[PDB]
Amino acid sequence: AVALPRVSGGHDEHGHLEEFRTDPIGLMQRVRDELGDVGTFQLAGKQVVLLSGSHANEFFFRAGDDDLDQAKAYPFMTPIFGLRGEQMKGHAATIEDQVRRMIADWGEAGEIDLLDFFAELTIYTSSACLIGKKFRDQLDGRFAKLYHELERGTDPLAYVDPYLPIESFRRRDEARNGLVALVADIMNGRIANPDRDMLDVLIAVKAETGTPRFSADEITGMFISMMFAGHHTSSGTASWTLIELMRHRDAYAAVIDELDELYGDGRSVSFHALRQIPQLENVLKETLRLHPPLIILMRVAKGEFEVQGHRIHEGDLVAASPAISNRIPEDFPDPHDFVPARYEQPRQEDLLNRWTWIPFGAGRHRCVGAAFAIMQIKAIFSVLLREYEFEMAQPPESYRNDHSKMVVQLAQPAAVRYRRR
Ligand code: HEM
Numbered sequence: 001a002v003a004l005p006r007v008s009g010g011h012d013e014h015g016h017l018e019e020f021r022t023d024p025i026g027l028m029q030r031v032r033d034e035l036g037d038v039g040t041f042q043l044a045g046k047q048v049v050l051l052s053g054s055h056a057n058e059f060f061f062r063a064g065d066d067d068l069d070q071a072k073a074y075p076f077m078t079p080i081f082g083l084r085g086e087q088m089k090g091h092a093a094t095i096e097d098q099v100r101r102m103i104a105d106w107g108e109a110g111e112i113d114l115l116d117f118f119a120e121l122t123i124y125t126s127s128a129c130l131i132g133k134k135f136r137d138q139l140d141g142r143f144a145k146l147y148h149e150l151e152r153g154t155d156p157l158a159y160v161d162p163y164l165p166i167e168s169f170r171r172r173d174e175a176r177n178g179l180v181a182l183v184a185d186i187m188n189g190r191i192a193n194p195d196r197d198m199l200d201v202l203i204a205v206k207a208e209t210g211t212p213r214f215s216a217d218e219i220t221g222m223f224i225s226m227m228f229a230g231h232h233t234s235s236g237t238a239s240w241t242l243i244e245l246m247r248h249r250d251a252y253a254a255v256i257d258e259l260d261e262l263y264g265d266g267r268s269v270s271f272h273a274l275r276q277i278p279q280l281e282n283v284l285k286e287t288l289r290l291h292p293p294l295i296i297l298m299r300v301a302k303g304e305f306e307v308q309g310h311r312i313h314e315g316d317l318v319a320a321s322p323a324i325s326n327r328i329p330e331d332f333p334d335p336h337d338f339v340p341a342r343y344e345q346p347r348q349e350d351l352l353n354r355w356t357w358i359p360f361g362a363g364r365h366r367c368v369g370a371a372f373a374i375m376q377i378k379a380i381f382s383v384l385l386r387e388y389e390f391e392m393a394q395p396p397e398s399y400r401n402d403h404s405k406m407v408v409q410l411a412q413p414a415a416v417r418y419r420r421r
């Protein structure tokens with residue numbers, strides 16, 4: 001019957017899959033450039049209906065699980081798995097502590113790799129806040145390294161089959177087994193050498209036979225799941241926030257002055273990370289607009305819908321793209337330029353473009369972790385920027401993301417040098 005508009009190219013074995021695995025943003029932009037607000041590309045044996053623009057995005061984000069389901073939209077997660085405002089102050093204090101612990105051995109000056117640093121830091125902030133400080137204290141660099149391998153195991157080939165015999169998938173499975181072993185060791189460690197946390201709660205549950213209900217494997221899967229949403233997103237966002245501050249010294253200087261003035265009231269990071277830090281918040285908003293951690297959002301249609309005359313049927317993959325929508329020229333003047341001022345009271349481009357400023361989604365599925373993520377950035381930089389001065393150790397334009405996996409991560413090198421203030 002009727003065929004939806006299809007983007008050019010995709011003449012490879014799996015259609016546009018190979019291009020999606022190399023330059024997904026370019027592919028999605030070409031879909032919009034050639035077809036408009038509703039266009040398709042072929043992801044192996046699956047047609048993806050890519051929606052963009054306010055009108056189409058509104059349909060996407062206002063749709064409940066009854067119309068567009070996310071349940072089976074991400075097959076790459078199956079092998080991997082196998083927030084209260086009142087607690088926010090406590091989490092801010094926890095994050096401050098974790099950052100100070102991470103930079104405790106920095107000394108007077110040195111060099112760091114952003115991916116390595118923030119990936120490890122966010123493993124500690126996430127585990128400490130979500131599972132418990134007790135659990136985080138039993139973790140070290142090994143956990144972060146293994147967790148990284150899990151994220152690297154999200155090749156788009158998962159849309160063909162999540163268990164293909166490729167190196168990244170093999171490393172993904174090996175990494176998960178390694179995490180189970182680490183968790184099993186922690187459990188055994190508590191038996192021999194007794195504030196209780198989530199792990200203690202799970203260990204205490206008994207089966208209908210008196211035996212422990214949960215195995216190290218089941219517990220590990222729960223913990224992986226609890227930490228996955230916020231890890232790669234917060235890690236990447238922290239890295240890009242620092243990169244953009246260094247790329248734009250005027251913003252860097254403004255944030256520094258602001259931080260010094262604000263903390264002059266003598267209140268802690270747990271107080272200030274939950275309150276306005278204007279310049280930093282606008283730099284963060286702009287960083288998220290330009291470098292949204294999730295470049296594409298997927299759904300599986302559960303019924304028949306029509307968007308601008310185009311028909312969507314049950315079973316069809318439907319997607320929205322923060323990467324593309326966040327840069328629509330009509331909605332964001334000079335979309336490729338770093339302009340924190342676009343979020344100040346006069347313009348408020350994030351609030352005005354309810355359906356296209358979507359680094360945190362919109363509508364019914366709006367990010368429930370956004371408040372936590374924003375607080376975390378404020379807490380992290382409140383510490384880092386007041387303690388140290390940062391400079392780029394490589395050309396500004398050489399910092400870039402690796403888009404070869406569904407989980408976007410910073411490519412290396414991403415070297416930065418620091419010196420005590
Ligand atoms: C900078 C960090 C983060 C970014 C950029 C981000 C982005 C997003 C986006 C784009 C959506 C919409 C997804 C969709 O419509 O398919 C979303 C939803 C959501 N996020 Fe995040 N997120 C971040 C951190 C977190 C954290 C820390 C948590 C965990 C506490 C989290 C939990 C969720 C949940 C549960 C939803 C769905 C809410 C619902 O369906 O009602 N996010 N996030």
Ligand SMILES: CC[C@@H](C(=O)Nc1ccncc1)c1ccccc1
Nearest residue numbers: 074077228229230233294296406407
């Ligand atoms: C579970 C991983 C999944 C996701 O929903 N992540 C997610 C992260 C933060 N907040 C909400 C969802 C995803 C989707 C596309 C690309 C990479 C990973």
